[PDB]
Ligand SMILES: [Ca+2]
Ligand SMILES: [Ca+2]
Ligand SMILES: [Mg+2]
């Protein structure tokens with residue numbers, strides 16, 4: 001029980017961290033691409 | 038939370054008032070906001086208000102307390118609050134009682150933490166003066182008081198000068214989006230016009246070097262922006278300029294002009 | 296009142312709505328109505344308030360359909376003059 | 392060849408559930424005591440909170456899936472209640488247990504996401520939904536591991552019906568006070 | 580008591596709805612007629628709210644001059660945003676249509692305080708917007724003037 | 736003169752003639768906005 005719950009917690013945390021890092025990178029690139037014509 | 042600002046909203050808290058405030062605050066046309074809205078009222082919300090708060094799960098919090106009680110102010114972390122927005126009951130039986138209650142709320146908040154910025158509403162001008170006489174209240178650091186009667190009468194007087202200016206200003210300071218009407222009616226042109234909001238931006242060095250009409254027409258023709266310690270309204274003959282534009286993205290290019 | 300309506304089953308209909316709400320007027324098909332009769336509270340504590348409410352009802356009905364005969368009961372003469380001051384109120388086509 | 396049931400063991404599932412509950416509670420309390428007088432996380436927390444509420448299209452999809460799968464889990468509990476209380480059932484034959492496996496995996500992932508999105512972890516631990524997640528999924532995992540089934544605290548799946556009013560409120564389906572009250576009363 | 584220091588101000592005692600009083604001040608030859616209600620907050624109930632403003636607006640619209648009264652510039656204050664549908668008899672009234680899309684508001688013939696609330700949001704994001712609005716409608720209301728009017732409660 | 740917008744006749748765009756007097760406001764028209772002779776334009780004077 002606790003092992004599965006910890007596995008799910010870690011999986012969700014890792015997925016959220018990866019997705020938010022990807023979102024931050026995409027935001028940085030789309031803000032940098034706006035300055036040049 | 039570190040890096041996450043928050044503001045405390047108190048006063049006349051009802052379903053309609055909170056719904057309007059959240060519609061105006063967390064607007065799609067508004068840029069991406071990063072502040073939390075913490076409501077503090079002494080009456081528990083209804084089922085409809087609870088559902089409305091549940092819709093804004095990660096952006097709106099509610100805490101039951103009294104503004105006059107310092108413990109409730111400490112609970113909502115008013116010391117670290119970016120600002121405190123005090124809402125007023127504009128449709129009250131007598132404006133004197135509501136204005137006096139707002140005076141008491143401002144007095145209590147400034148008593149707890151005198152360095153906080155307060156935005157409040159007023160229904161009479163003399164109550165605004167009474168607020169101006171508070172020791173901790175200073176207008177240079179950000180404290181403001183929107184007087185409903187004063188502003189509405191100013192709008193009406195300006196409309197008496199040029200008819201239709203009151204609705205121009207009302208649509209101008211209200212956040213709205215872009216709507217296209219296929220049918221060739223007056224509503225299409227009106228909705229094209231209403232899509233303009235008002236922004237502020239720092240002008241470039243070249244703009245500061247030149248004269249006001251020259252930079253204004255240069256912004257209108259090239260940048261396609263209408264550019265409107267004191268505030269100078271359309272002067273004759275580095276600095277903050279007021280623009281009318283569809284969104285802040287178009288205003289931002291004024292600083293970046295070469 | 297339901298019993299009274301049942302007694303006149305084929306002659307009388309009832310609907311719930313407000314004269315100030317245009318949707319309610321659209322429900323009762325007031326644009327095709329021959330006339331609109333506005334009853335008044337003769338034994339009212341404040342005749343001025345009742346007359347003002349009747350004037351408001353007339354204003355709403357004329358706003359929705361400005362080409363309908365309206366027969367109304369009025370309690371004061373000055374309020375009657377105010378009623379005739381309405382732009383859409385004309386006595387030549389049956390408004391009394 | 393469709394044999395019968397013999398020896399009776401049930402402390403495995405209940406013990407696993409009690410461990411999953413009390414061990415986590417004790418870890419939370421120990422962390423709090425250690426933090427007491429020293430005796431990017433916000434970003435992922437906000438993302439999880441947006442996911443939980445129907446703020447994004449994927450959020451609405453997750454909410455609708457939670458609704459449908461809670462209903463399905465209740466129906467599966469009914470079907471299993473038609474069976475004997477203690478039985479032995481191999482994983483690969485009956486199609487009910489794989490469906491229960493998928494349902495419990497989804498519910499475990501949903502619980503993990505809700506924990507990530509929670510403000511106060513201790514008060515989140517003592518929640519009706521969290522409790523019924525504690526006493527339902529570990530028993531199912533133990534049952535599929537041991538190839539034997541016990542009708543344990545599976546009725547707690549019905550307690551998943553309480554959150555229906557909040558689920559509908561998130562999807563902007565319930566707006567009025569009377570309908571909200573009716574849904575709350577009926578679900579409870 | 581707060582108006583004696585302003586030139587070219589006259590007072591006509593009488594009902595603002597009487598036709599003789601409005602004809603005396605030559606209401607047809609005016610830049611704008613502003614209908615204001617002082618005790619409009621007391622009346623609680625939409626069935627008993629904003630009678631006088633609407634009735635006076637219709638009365639002025641129905642006047643005849645040896646031209647018609649529909650060309651007189653009129654602005655009316657309202658406290659119920661749904662009462663704007665009675666100001667004009669030509670538009671398509673609808674209780675669902677919000678105020679700023681309503682024809683009297685688009686023409687500038689109606690005003691309500693319900694449109695100023697959003698100012699708070701703007702005032703939070705840019706107080707320069709509030710100071711620009713204040714300095715544009717009141718004609719350069721400087722803060723030193725605010726202090727002076729706070730002290731003497733008058734104009735010197 | 737700094738011009739905000741125009742105050743256009745409600746029935747100006749309609750081809751059918753009418754005697755309507757009401758006008759609606761247009762704020763910040765584009766550069767290439769078609770303009771009608773029967774118009775009033777909001778603007779500003781720089782003179783005491
Ligand atoms: Ca706007
Ligand atoms: Ca109308
Ligand atoms: Mg929060």
Ligand SMILES: [Mg+2]
Pocket residue numbers: 304305306308
């Ligand atoms: Mg019949």
